[PDB]
């Protein structure tokens, strides 16, 4: 039967400093026991000084990051280019995620 | 499929259909309501274009929305039923979800919105009805009296009237109701109510029905006699001068 | 007859224009925006001495940082306020923050032209425009204190001061002179109170008029009669003073 | 299951309902009133699936009350039970049926006779001298099939119940935390606050 | 697109009239005459086949239609409206009756169905009433023989005999004189032919006339044998020949 | 568009009246008169058949008295077809009520529902109202004998005796003149026949031009019985009351 | 005449005119003036914001549709919102699905097609707003004029609104001049402000009254208002 | 009476549909455009009024392609023309998707035909304000068509519409007579450029811009392509020369 | 009130003007056509008029092939004619699919008529200003001619004609049949029937025809086809050698 899903491995890490923050993650993408790419970036700059990663099932992680970035874009279009605070991005993402509560995004996500 | 805009603006800024809805209210029999210090009374007149009816089963003018709230109106009867029904349903729904019966203001605000809605929806004409909604909020004793109209507007009154000759009877109440000292009794409150109706009913023992609402779902309508007794004593107030 | 969304030869929408005529017949509403807050005042205008003047609600709270005043067919404003309140709360749920005053206003104005009998653009199921205009006043971290005028035309303007309703053109001219970029909240209160007194048919008192404001510190508050009555007194005095 | 008993005597209907509410390994509440008053002279007890139970009860309560106000009249117990059966009968063939069993006891002011109705979540209705839902029925039908007489007084009825409740406490595996009893007669519905030891 | 005619095209005028119903009746008044007579053992409906050209084949145009094997209809007014009515009627006879009770509907009910259809075209949004009047004749086990008239308004009434169309007034009068509750089917067929002759300007023969009856069962027109209970249709259209034969005895 | 041909059947006149309803009523006024008189032991429904002929089959006919339930019947005044549409939906409502509560539908409940349907065509939809007025004659164990009347507006009321259709003003006055609370079915039957007799726009009041029905609770039984008089039965009662 | 053929858009006059569309166009004229002009490296939008009172703001007239596109409005604000928003989606769609920036020429076709729909079906009303679209895509700078009729045209420069005829003649003259303001933004802008003033009369473009937007080779569509434009008054 | 010209689907007493006729007016009032069928393809050309010097030259294109072998040009309300092409485009994709083979010109014609005719059936839509000339090469030859707002259309040897349809038609008729053997793709391209130039006299006031496109089984392999650069200039001159 | 002339509602006289005016439109093309029945075939002749020289004569036709067996000729504007044709084709294809046999000419006529009757009663759909003549050699009825109009009326003919000079053609044919005493052209070959058709077409219209002035369609057992310029020319030459 068709399984919607997959696992692309990788890991990721995010640490918050007093006036800085980091989000790291290997660049290896796998499937079962094969390597798909030794370099497939997984942490992104989304704008308004926010970096995010959605690790787990690649397809889901990408769709999410993509959906979020587009979310930031419209946040500007709708609130006179107001900057999206990290805390607001978080809440916005909760909604993005819980939106598929019954067909989840198979990803662990950090911003 | 029918959505013609029947309620639209005219050059002067009037919604004629809503305007004409009020004309239908002016035509309806009269209705009045005055609040006492521990009660509210609702009086209404009875037409006489045809007399030979069966008072037992002919629909009465004052209706109960819930055990603690009543609604009277002036205008098209058919139209009022629709509103009474909706009000009654909303009343039960509110209890079911909030676990507490509606407040008179709430039930009034709901009825008003339904009316307002019919003024700017396609394919429908406004309700040719104005109402007087009264009662006591749950676990409260301060009487409540509100009035609504086709436009969807609503507010509370110490006393008010609607229907034909409401003009006349309003004057009576304006110069007969002291907010300082409201009818401190159910009796003097019911009297003030009939007196005001007599101004227009022109001797109508059977052409006047009063209902008395007290706190804690205590509602009751007076019988011909009880009312007739108020008429009798009142006509003497006049003759004794 | 003729389409509810037709254009006059002068490039205007009849229904929207006729809508404005209705608003002119409305009770006066005035708003003054200062660097200490925005003040909103309205003419109760009870139609009978029996009507309990405080059951007249022409000033309502959208959110703790947004409040508004209405003029014209006030019944039409309920769904507008409802939409507004929801939009405010909803924004907060999705973003964990306050809805910007302009955004909230933009949202309300989006309902404006959604009227017709089959207007090819979406599902604008409303038989006529709204017969009321609003003064939306609030505050947000990005543009501080703001005053907006939302009309049935869908367009909204930002004002430092604005008057809508029966005595508008009159009161508007007054505001022109009286308003300056350094008014205090107290000055603005009296000012609104004074301008209401001129345009109102009835003698202004703490019962046929109502004030309110919105300040970053305590948000939107509606002045209770006692608080206003004294400002009334304070005004009569400053006037008699010259 | 929970205990839901009903017994119709001479001039009244008595409903006994267990007070425990258990979820998993814990007894969450021991004072639950598994009943709703549909009208001044009609009472309904219920048991079944966790959520459906109260939701259904309250839903039915709302409808009867709405009927009462609309018509300014109280529907007969027979009529109310017919309404409830039709509801359950519609539910059984819907996306997610209400898994609730009920006992409807009322005093018909027109016939001046108490009535007891048993209706299960399938919409199976039947009128009886006495009835019960769940495993309780397995002990109480023969108990009552023995100690029951139509002319019993409300008092004899309560003793008859006590006899049932004792049998249930003796043999039933679960601790239902006692019952709440209510009487439906010509003067409305009242609750026997002293059954924890009558 | 989309029918944006969601309002009634038939409304009450200040006088209390329903204009379109009236006009529809006017349309019927212009239609060729048609009639129906009820005997004690049958019913007869007939009308004139007003061929609209000598090049047209009058056969390919029946004004008399079978709805059920024991019910037939004829009309006066706008042929096309009639045609579609017969279709709807024939179908409703199944959908609303045969498919439910396993037996064809009794005359009054089927008529009641048709009447319903017509009533709706008097109130539904965006439509004009039907411009026809029908005469439906049938027989059912518990009601015997019956004759009904259905009007554009949707009203229908039972008749002993009646006529509609062009010379209805004149024809109705001629019927009142020759009708009696003892007439035999042949007597009515005769009377029918007579009444119809007055309304015909030109040729009056089995090719310019359309006449059908609702009488005895025709096991010969059943199409099969082997089922005692099934005896054949009571509805039979008379052949051009069978008509002429009766014309010589006119 | 089509807005050009829309009669706007559900709008108010400057006087706050509903054109269509008023005109529908105007239509009803030319309909055969129908009378309902409620006595202590029953209800009487009498109606005048508008237009008839020698050839008209009166046996199989019905155009004014319809049975809705076993305890409720109605007298019609207006468009027969419109009446039948409402009659049938009325009959369904009765059955739903029964299937739901296992009790016959109270007379007023049925009357209100039907009147509500009418009121609907009065406030929305852009369709013409039904050109019908009903006199409902029913019985229930809560109010016993009841008489009601409903019209195009959707308004309904209860009466002791009432008329609808043509010459109601005349008929009402005559009824208001000889009706007495303690009346009896047989009395009402006569009062009814007389009234029609004095308001008919016809020469004489013959049986062939009538429909008669009574709802009694036949003493020798204990239940309600609806009787719809047959031509012969009408002819008799017609002679007896002294109208031959 | 006209009076009988202007009841709604679905009606043609005996001469072949759609009066409702025409009346819509009339709302553009009553609208404040705005101007657009492009070189080969940039494109600029200079719009005159109009104010109600001296206590009211000068209603924003420039909307950004994407990093590489934007427009100016003259007429009914709400309609510009509807249309700009639609354009914002089309741009967004193009990116997300094809990872391709939307061609300005194509954005024009989309606007025309959307407007045209409200001029052939009953019930709807034409859009009462004019739009000027500027943008930098895979073929350089671009300027588009959008008319509610559904007609969209690509120009080197132009203007719409009240007295717009002034600026339009000026640019029809200055053509050879500004068309070569390549690599220099401040010049193209100044060249624009000098075109917009050619339609003034009432007053002079103040600071809180002037509004400019620009896009080009290495300039993501951006909007300047107030202090930001002070150096152009 | 009158008013038969205010609603689109209405028939006037003489059996016409005035709204459609008024649509034609809008067409005649527009730019001129033409189509020339040659021995193995078709050529399209249209006039492009240069309202001002601000119009970026060669940019505002008018001729449109449908699929890969159909060329469409129209006179009248441009937006309406695009709308009709969008449809045609879908109409074509749908055909190809089910039958694999790209849509035959005649088949395509009726698609546009039926769709346009459709807009003359209801009063809730306006007829098309354009006349369209389109065509291409298919399984058996080249086909040229012209469609009227009425939805009417026929096959042509040469066709023209717009402001100077007469000048054009005049010219076209000459060609038809002076070339009974058939014109050539190369020839038609120039001939077309000329006819546009001539027909431009009925608008000689404003300066214009030429635009041509063609579909020739040999010159373009049966695909629709625009005439650009050299071949365009060559034809522009061929006209510029005979205009004097 | 006066709107009873714009939409399909009854006029006080009980008439439907829009349908009447729809009929008017059927003569707009000023073409005449007629159909006659052979012994085992059906023929339809129709004037073909091509005014413009820019027109591709081969695309101008008012005769359509509805199905392998049914042919339909239209009298009225071409857009409405094509609309009716497409529907008729669709209708005929579906009938075969659902019922397992070719839709009979009379049935397709009744079906198309019914559809027209609808534009007569429902307001929003306008009638089609065309008259449809269907022909074929039905597997049950033999040669058949059925015609329908904007009224929704329909009937079968022994022969018929339609167009502006419809009446002269009809009386012409009527007379010929009063004479022959039979309801058809007693001819074995359709070639002679087509000739007969073209002949009486001339006698009635008092006009001579060239191979490009006519349009001919023939219906035979299992096939309906139209003739070519040359097929006609051949027919014209034949009648030429008799007069």
Swiss-Prot record, chain A:
One of its GO terms (cellular component) is proteasome complex. One of its GO terms (biological process) is proteasome-mediated ubiquitin-dependent protein catabolic process. It is found in: Cytoplasm; Nucleus. Keywords: Cytoplasm, Nucleus, Proteasome. The keyword Nucleus applies. The 26S proteasome consists of a 20S proteasome core and two 19S regulatory subunits. The 20S proteasome core is composed of 28 subunits that are arranged in four stacked rings, resulting in a barrel-shaped structure. The two end rings are each formed by seven alpha subunits, and the two central rings are each formed by seven beta subunits. The catalytic chamber with the active sites is on the inside of the barrel. Non-catalytic component of the proteasome which degrades poly-ubiquitinated proteins in the cytoplasm and in the nucleus. It is essential for the regulated turnover of proteins and for the removal of misfolded proteins. The proteasome is a multicatalytic proteinase complex that is characterized by its ability to cleave peptides with Arg, Phe, Tyr, Leu, and Glu adjacent to the leaving group at neutral or slightly basic pH. It has an ATP-dependent proteolytic activity. Belongs to the peptidase T1B family. This is Proteasome subunit beta type-6. It comes from Saccharomyces cerevisiae (strain ATCC 204508 / S288c). The lineage of its organism: Eukaryota, Fungi, Dikarya, Ascomycota, Saccharomycotina. The chain holds residues 20 to 130 of 241 of the full protein.
Curated annotation (Swiss-Prot), chain C:
GO terms for cellular component: nucleus; proteasome complex; proteasome core complex, alpha-subunit complex; proteasome storage granule. It holds the Pfam family Proteasome_A_N. Signal peptide: none annotated. Present with 17100 molecules/cell in log phase SD medium. Belongs to the peptidase T1A family. The proteasome degrades poly-ubiquitinated proteins in the cytoplasm and in the nucleus. It is essential for the regulated turnover of proteins and for the removal of misfolded proteins. The proteasome is a multicatalytic proteinase complex that is characterized by its ability to cleave peptides with Arg, Phe, Tyr, Leu, and Glu adjacent to the leaving group at neutral or slightly basic pH. It has an ATP-dependent proteolytic activity. This is Proteasome subunit alpha type-5. The gene is PUP2.
UniProtKB/Swiss-Prot annotation, chain D:
This is Proteasome subunit beta type-4. The modification Phosphoserine is found at residue 76. One of its GO terms (biological process) is proteasome-mediated ubiquitin-dependent protein catabolic process. Present with 21800 molecules/cell in log phase SD medium. Belongs to the peptidase T1B family. The 26S proteasome consists of a 20S proteasome core and two 19S regulatory subunits. The 20S proteasome core is composed of 28 subunits that are arranged in four stacked rings, resulting in a barrel-shaped structure. The two end rings are each formed by seven alpha subunits, and the two central rings are each formed by seven beta subunits. The catalytic chamber with the active sites is on the inside of the barrel. It comes from the Eukaryota. GO terms for molecular function: endopeptidase activator activity. The keyword Nucleus applies. Its main location: cytoplasm. Keywords: Acetylation, Cytoplasm, Nucleus, Phosphoprotein, Proteasome. Pfam families: Proteasome (PF00227). GO terms for cellular component: cytosol; endoplasmic reticulum membrane; nucleus; proteasome complex; proteasome core complex, beta-subunit complex. It comes from Saccharomyces cerevisiae (strain ATCC 204508 / S288c) (Baker's yeast). The modification N-acetylmethionine is found at residue 1. Signal peptide: none annotated. It is found in: Cytoplasm; Nucleus. Gene3D superfamilies: Glutamine Phosphoribosylpyrophosphate, subunit 1, domain 1 (3.60.20.10). InterPro entries: Ntn_hydrolases_N (IPR029055), Proteasome_beta2 (IPR035206), Proteasome_bsu_CS (IPR016050), Proteasome_sua/b (IPR001353), Proteasome_suB-type (IPR023333). The gene is PRE1.
UniProtKB/Swiss-Prot annotation, chain G:
SUPFAM superfamilies: N-terminal nucleophile aminohydrolases (Ntn hydrolases). The keyword Ubl conjugation applies. The proteasome degrades poly-ubiquitinated proteins in the cytoplasm and in the nucleus. It is essential for the regulated turnover of proteins and for the removal of misfolded proteins. The proteasome is a multicatalytic proteinase complex that is characterized by its ability to cleave peptides with Arg, Phe, Tyr, Leu, and Glu adjacent to the leaving group at neutral or slightly basic pH. It has an ATP-dependent proteolytic activity. One of its GO terms (biological process) is proteasome-mediated ubiquitin-dependent protein catabolic process. InterPro entries: Ntn_hydrolases_N, Proteasome_alpha, Proteasome_alpha-type, Proteasome_asu_N, Proteasome_sua/b. It is found in: Cytoplasm; Nucleus. This is Proteasome subunit alpha type-6. The 26S proteasome consists of a 20S proteasome core and two 19S regulatory subunits. The 20S proteasome core is composed of 28 subunits that are arranged in four stacked rings, resulting in a barrel-shaped structure. The two end rings are each formed by seven alpha subunits, and the two central rings are each formed by seven beta subunits. The catalytic chamber with the active sites is on the inside of the barrel. It comes from Saccharomyces cerevisiae (strain ATCC 204508 / S288c). Disulfide bonds: none annotated. PROSITE patterns: PROTEASOME_ALPHA_1, PROTEASOME_ALPHA_2. The modification Phosphoserine is found at residue 13. The gene is PRE5. Signal peptide: none annotated. There is a cross-link at residue 190 (Glycyl lysine isopeptide (Lys-Gly) (interchain with G-Cter in ubiquitin)).
